[PDB]
Structure 1
Amino acid sequence: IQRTPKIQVYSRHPAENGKSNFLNCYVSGFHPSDIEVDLLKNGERIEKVEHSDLSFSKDWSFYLLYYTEFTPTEKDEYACRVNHVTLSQPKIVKWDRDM
């Protein structure tokens, strides 16, 4: 069975520019477990990104939360890039602060 990952990019606390916050990329609903997720700030990949221990839900598919501490500004765009065997190309979903 191979299931495509579902992805959400969001802030731990509602974002206000200039205040440190956290950027989560929750990837869920996938199988197999090998998936590459990395948070990109302005296209550049961020290092110093942490992530949870791999677990699965009821239908046996996996999910993982990747995160980094960040401080929004107006100028900086953030995104989460994900690449998995079901994906013909990696998926870059950008952070929107209203979602």
Structure 2
Amino acid sequence: MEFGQAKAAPKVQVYSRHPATAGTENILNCYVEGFHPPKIDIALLKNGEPMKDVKYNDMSFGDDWTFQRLVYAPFTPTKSDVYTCRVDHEAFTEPQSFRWEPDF
């Protein structure tokens, strides 16, 4: 971060391991990068509910000191279920939700 900058907002992508086929097992990914400080809440949600067996990879950081983390969970997407990654960080005024776009 630049001198006199306090914090940096997360940039977020939500994507599946494989192209989405409704009814086929897949993995849901939420990758969050470019944030500081490292304190963050990253939540994978199915219809607003916390998903089973979410895993959180170790954090890395770039030359600008900002952090990155992959968060993922196994899932079986359908035509009707709504999958989001909700991210709360002090550089957001309120938690931000990022919707997975299936593109079946």
TM tier, smaller: over 0.9
Is 1:78 matched up with 2:83? yes
Name which of 10, 31, 35 aligns with 1:5: 10
**Whose strand fraction is larger, Structure 1's or Structure 2's?**
1
Is 1:44 matched up with 2:52? no
Is 1:67 matched up with 2:61? no
- 4+ long deviations beyond 2 Å: none
1:75 CA displacement: 1.2
Q: Percent identity, aligned pairs only? A: 51
Q: Any unmatched runs of 5+ in structure 2?
A: 1-5
Provide the rounded CA distance (Å) in 2 between the counterparts of 1:93 and 1:5: 12
Matches within 5 A, 1:10-29: 10-29=15-34
1:97 CA displacement: 2.1
The code of the aligned residue for 1:76 comes to D
1:57 CA displacement: 1.4
Partner of 1:94: 99
After superposition, the CA RMSD in angstroms is: 0.9
1:47 CA displacement: 3.6
Report the count of equivalent residues. Answer: 98
